[PDB]
Structures are given as structure tokens and as C-alpha cells.
Amino acid sequence: EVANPEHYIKHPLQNRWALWFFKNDKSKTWQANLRLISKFDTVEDFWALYNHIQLSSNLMPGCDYSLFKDGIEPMWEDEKNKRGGRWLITLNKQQRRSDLDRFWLETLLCLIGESFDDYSDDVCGAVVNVRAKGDKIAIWTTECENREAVTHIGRVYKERLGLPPKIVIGYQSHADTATKSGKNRFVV
């Protein structure tokens, strides 16, 4: 007889996730300021990383966190991002104190817990931008033409964030973001 797995085994995540940090430095390229922190693939290792790092509300404005599937870089130019896009949450200045950390934590949970069911494979990762004019949180998906998947993810995400029907959140493709000034392909 061997030991019972339940008593000593870590709780495996469906995917391995990598956490990235971005710090704004004017002298360098956008890419150069993007850096890997750390990867994990269990619930326990998720918490070990989360619990020792700064809350987003405490980061210096100009900085980002990004949680992305191992092997997917948190940039448009990644193979899995190029034809993709993002569900974007736009937060006003007061929401840094009330919602930012709550919404970001909920987003991580949606990611690592695979809350998107059949469409988990469409999810690339998520990004929180800490910015003076207003913080942003976003889930990145792989294909902006996948209307069924993109739309399912939006709906799940909104309800998990607990946002009411009056709050309209949009999905833009990265190709549009990269190449145009600030329309939504979908709303939720």
C-alpha cells in the first residue's frame, strides 16, 4: 500500500502560468521593460507567488502585471496573440482603491481555475496596467474571429467581476490596438 495522494500532493493546475512584470523606463524599448518573474502550475505555488508580491494598487504607475500561459509572451506579436484581442476593463481614478485589487485577483482565479470551460484554450492570459489616468484590466484571447468563444468569455468574466448590465465592457482586436487610435468588435 502507498500513501493517499490527497494528504501530500499539491493541487495541479490545468496549465502552467507565467507571471510577468513591466516597469516603464523611457530610455528603453517597450519590449526591454517587459520581464519574466516566475512560473507555477499548482494552487499552492500560485498563492506562494501572489502572497509575497505587491498588490497592483501599490505599484508605481506605469507598471503592469501579466499572467500568461507558459509559452505565450504577453505581447501582441506572440503567435497566439497576433490574431487575438482583449476584453478590457477600464477603471476610473477612485476604483484603484475600491476595485482594482479585487478585480485583478478575480481575474487570476478565472484564469488558473479555468473558469471559461470549453473555451479555456482560447484564453492566452491577462494584463493589469497601473496608470495615472485610469487603471486597466484585460483578458487576452487567441482569435478575434472566434465569436462564440470571445463572447462566452466576456459573459463569464463580467458576471465573475459582478458588473451590472449598465456597465458596458468591450473587446478590441490587438491588430486594431496596434495600428489605430483608441471601436469594439463585441460588447458585454
Binding site: 493541487h11 495541479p12 494552487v43 500560485f46 498563492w47 481555475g113 473558469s115 465573475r160
Partner: peptide, 12 residues
């Protein structure tokens, strides 16, 4: 496939 609810995850 591994799915975890938010309540399960928050317990850790």
C-alpha cells in the same frame, strides 16, 4: 482538465 471554483481556490 482541471477546473477549480473561486471558493476552492480562496481556501488555499
Amino acid at each position: 482538465k482541471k477546473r477549480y471554483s473561486r471558493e476552492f481556490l480562496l481556501g488555499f
